[PDB]
């Protein structure tokens, strides 16, 4: 019902995006961020794979690794490139966690990310034309 509508909307969003159309503004942001993440990881394939292979992840230290990376990524400011890196980092951190059988971390990571987006990135995004502008720039 709610579940069924969610499935329908996901599929239709995909189909529409394939034809250069969009279900909604949120759907356009989701897809742009997906593609920006791909483009970032492609353009810097070696370096991205290089430092992600240096990730040393354990359940007890996962948050510390997350925070050390993120606070350094945004140490002197925000820009969209850093925002894309933040997502790609969280993605890589989730995969690397599953890569080493630590799946309980994935939902924690999502929450740490959502909180950092809300508390520390949202103020900048809103002063810089919002996610709609990112969709424009991409």
């Amino acid at each position: 019902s709610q579940s069924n509508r969610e499935l329908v909307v996901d599929f239709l969003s995909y189909k529409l995006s394939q034809k250069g159309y969009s279900w909604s503004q949120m759907a356009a942001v989701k897809q742009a961020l997906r593609e920006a993440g791909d483009e970032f990881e492609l353009r810097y394939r070696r370096a991205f794979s290089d430092l992600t292979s240096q990730l040393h992840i354990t359940p007890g230290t996962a948050y510390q690794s997350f925070e050390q990376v993120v606070n350094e990524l945004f140490r002197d400011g925000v820009n969209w490139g850093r925002i894309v890196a933040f997502f790609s980092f969280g993605g890589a951190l989730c995969v690397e966690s599953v890569d080493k059988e630590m799946q309980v971390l994935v939902s924690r990571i999502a929450a740490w990310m959502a909180t950092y987006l809300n508390d520390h990135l949202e103020p900048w995004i809103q002063e810089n034309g919002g996610w709609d502008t990112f969709v424009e720039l991409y």
Binding site: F40, R43, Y44, A47, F48, L51, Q54, L55, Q64, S65, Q68, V69, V70, N71, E72, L73, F74, R75, N79, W80, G81, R82, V84, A85, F89, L137
Partner: peptide
Amino acid sequence: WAREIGAXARRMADDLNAQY
């Protein structure tokens, strides 16, 4: 370490920023 992954993410991010 993680700090100095974060710094060498920030080379990559700033010079991705340069299309943004």
